[PDB]
Amino acid sequence: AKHQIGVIGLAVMGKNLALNIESKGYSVAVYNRLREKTDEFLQEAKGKNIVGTYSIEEFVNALEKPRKILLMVKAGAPTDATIEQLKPHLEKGDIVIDGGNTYFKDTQRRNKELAELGIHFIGTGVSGGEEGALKGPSIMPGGQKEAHELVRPIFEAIAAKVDGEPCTTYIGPDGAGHYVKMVHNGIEYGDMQLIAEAYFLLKHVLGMDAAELHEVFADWNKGELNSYLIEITADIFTKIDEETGKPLVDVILDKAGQKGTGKWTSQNALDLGVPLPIITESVFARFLSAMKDERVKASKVLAGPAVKPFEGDRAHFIEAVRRALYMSKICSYAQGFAQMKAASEEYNWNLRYGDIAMIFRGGCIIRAQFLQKIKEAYDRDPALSNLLLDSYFKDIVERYQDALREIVATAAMRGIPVPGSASALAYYDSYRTAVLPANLIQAQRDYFGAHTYERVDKEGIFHTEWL
Amino acid sequence: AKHQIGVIGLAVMGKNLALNIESKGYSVAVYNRLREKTDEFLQEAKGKNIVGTYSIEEFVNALEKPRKILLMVKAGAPTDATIEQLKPHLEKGDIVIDGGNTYFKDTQRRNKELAELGIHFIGTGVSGGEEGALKGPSIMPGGQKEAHELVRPIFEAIAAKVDGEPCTTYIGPDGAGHYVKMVHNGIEYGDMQLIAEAYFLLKHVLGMDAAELHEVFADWNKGELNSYLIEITADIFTKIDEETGKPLVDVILDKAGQKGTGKWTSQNALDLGVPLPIITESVFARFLSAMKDERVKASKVLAGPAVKPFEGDRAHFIEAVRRALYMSKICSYAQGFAQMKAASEEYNWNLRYGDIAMIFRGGCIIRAQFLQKIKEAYDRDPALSNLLLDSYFKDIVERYQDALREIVATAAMRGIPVPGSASALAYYDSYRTAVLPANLIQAQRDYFGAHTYERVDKEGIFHTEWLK
Ligand SMILES: O=C(O)[C@H](O)[C@@H](O)[C@H](O)[C@H](O)COP(=O)(O)O
Ligand SMILES: O=C(O)[C@H](O)[C@@H](O)[C@H](O)[C@H](O)COP(=O)(O)O
């Protein structure tokens, strides 16, 4: 018999997506190199319209033309080796979809190589984790338009929906979807760091235990901060470790891990020439936390300030931490969306930033009502160069900046590190400043490397003989 | 005949090095892919023991064996293309030296490829701008030790000297030299930002004009901040523009350019898992400065804080800025040398940090008295994991931290951007803190992604069914 779509790669992620697809009424053919994974899945999927296949050739010939193939294998060599194995069996107009957390430049290369053979390639971000894949992920496809239209109904049936809108859209050509999935990941790290900072601030300035941290974050999730990450943070602080009777979170080693994918947004921001301080500080902050042994060692030798207990208005401070968090979150998204814009211009993608905010509204980890406000900003002005300039975000920052300045000043004086929040404040004060101190930098570079400069008053290039 | 050393690539950097080599008694042959650069240089080099050659074969045949060839061409494809031109003609035991601003993995590759052929390869950082190349640069070579020994007298002859010692040493195997050169360049970016922030603070908090600013910086260069960058800064603040009667600095457009190599230290830190906040903020600050139009447009619509004029002790604030600047620089170097330690362990380079500190002492842009203190820290402890643990630097930061706190708080309250200095403080506060909020991050990661965590009280990898 002929099946509607094939999935290669049967880890939980691939299995759940194939289950999602089948529940939406499509017939699914599966293949996995490690034989046992297929055997297990077929027992897991009794009664469902999923068939196992046992070679690449069997798999390919079990599918309706034009063929739809979802790769969910290990990044790098195994993905390419599978694509290589598919090539002889596929025909002009067949569609290979890579759904892993792939570096967009890899997707660009595979797209280009397959195209020469008339085979289409879609690199797609899948967000939501393992449960999300089963129930409704965010899906971020990029590749040929003609190929996307063929697979679009499948994407649209399996994605999460907000207000009848599927959390999927055609992102753009080549590696656009994988690019946007990378930025999602970056933004995710920033949010987690900014929240970690709000926690540490409450813990140290106010001496808050887990139970009252629960209350605070639970309240926060009833307002503008409403989001999956805040939601789960409120719940984390309720958990009691049985063995010790301590809050579970206090027993967990403060050594933040990360996949090698974590650093990609920051590294790409550096290539494009776009400032991404908050997300980059967030990545560095994980690295510094992983240096736990160095840190406890330095704690016995390095002195902080000798500050007395906090005696100010406690309710005021809680709210100031909240507003500092929300403003910082805004600067981070402004930096992240400004990155996607530089990428769109550079790779010629014509990205729609309102559409991107729309797919982030559910399914994915950064999902929050917040993403609605971003969509609206781009609805109103598609070519908006920075989210800070939109009237909604502009109102917030003019009202919340006092709270962010107080938090930065207070953290500085009490010895509480707030790398993300501080760089958020510095970014805000740099972006709104017409004349920066880069005139001296420019003067210096000319002085020692005769790099030449431009002037404030005249047009054209200049070079002084300083020496 | 036969000349002692060859130079390929006659941009100003390669011409000056050749000139430099010649002035130390060596005979030099030169070649350039674009013929007119050679003709031009030869007009400039009459009086000098330098000859031009016009093919790669002629070039190679003009050199005494073992051949010593210095490559000063554009990075990437053109370097590789020149190496390819050279390969048919080189003989076993010949030495090619890439003095370009080369990514260290490229050097690693070229080193391997050339080694299989019996040809040695040295990738060398050369620092100090064009005047340094001419008068005395810092030379940071990496490669086969035996090959280095053969070029060592030439490096030592031309390098800058400080108190009789040349600013050059054997860095390590393969790409180690170009790696240290990269980090030097990262550190340079950080120092320039920290200074720019010092400037901007005095300018907006104290209302200093270019005359008061000059004073401050000249008075700083007589102290522990003594350095080339601070010296030229004190100088820059004296230049008046004739056709405006304005300080020239007030007339230069605030868009900081950068070479494509500028981002590399930060990108690599990300690869190695090392915290490099200050240098990276400095790269990003240059990117922000380049966005000049967005900033003017934004300046009309975005609100700053309400600020009364500054009322506190003015001499105190200048000293706080000075101290904030010195401490921040300490944190940046602490970060940058920690990155070198990481790369050394990763690539098995057995880096000698005191030696590196000593060759940064002259020739290169970041040259400063301060480097002696770094050298001494590694004398006391070669295996030192972070400079903040050394008694000199520990004592400085504990003394000056109060100043840095004041400057970060003041900047916040007054709307003055201090990205580099604020990240220095956050870094200090993070590094000295035994228990950071990453416990929450680990909880979150396990909650939504089953990533697992570790516990403070026992060994093992743990997962929680968070939903119940
Ligand atoms: O749900 C998702 O969005 C994906 O599964 C994935 O993008 C993941 O969250 C990141 O790669 C970060 O994971 P770490 O926090 O483990 O680095
Ligand atoms: O002296 C050096 O260090 C090098 O010859 C060279 O690498 C360069 O002068 C700097 O890297 C400046 O870089 P920018 O042009 O980016 O300021």
Residue numbers in the entry:
A (entry chain B): 2 to 468
B (entry chain A): 2 to 469
Q: Any passages from the paper?
A:
Two crystal structures of recombinant Geobacillus stearothermophilus 6-phosphogluconate dehydrogenase (Gs6PDH) in complex with the substrate 6-­phosphogluconate have been determined at medium resolution. Gs6PDH shares significant sequence identity and structural similarity with the enzymes from Lactococcus lactis, sheep liver and the protozoan parasite Trypanosoma brucei, for which a range of structures have previously been reported. Comparisons indicate that amino-acid sequence conservation is more pronounced in the two domains that contribute to the architecture of the active site, namely the N-terminal and C-terminal domains, compared with the central domain, which is primarily involved in the subunit–subunit associations required to form a stable dimer. The high degree of structural similarity, efficient level of expression and straightforward crystallization conditions mean that Gs6PDH may prove to be an appropriate model system for structure-based inhibitor design targeting the enzyme from Trypanosoma species.
Two isomorphous crystal structures were determined. Data set I was obtained from a sample grown in the presence of 6PG and NADP+ and data set II was obtained from crystals grown in the presence of R5P and NADP+. In neither structure was there electron density that could be attributed to NADP+. In structure I, 6PG is present in both active sites of the dimer that constitutes the asymmetric unit. Crystal I was frozen and stored in liquid nitrogen within one week of setting up the crystallization conditions. A pronounced similarity of the two subunits in the asymmetric units of both crystals is observed despite not employing noncrystallographic symmetry restraints during refinement. The overlay of 467 Cα positions of structure I subunit A on subunit B results in an r.m.s.d. of 0.53 Å; for structure II an r.m.s.d. of 0.70 Å is observed from the overlay of 470 Cα atoms. The overlay of the structure I and structure II dimers, 935 Cα atoms, gives an r.m.s.d. of 0.29 Å. The phosphate of 6PG is positioned by accepting hydrogen bonds from Tyr190, Lys260, Arg287 of one subunit and Arg446 of the partner subunit. Ordered water-mediated hydrogen bonds also link the phosphate group to Asn186, Glu189 and Thr262.
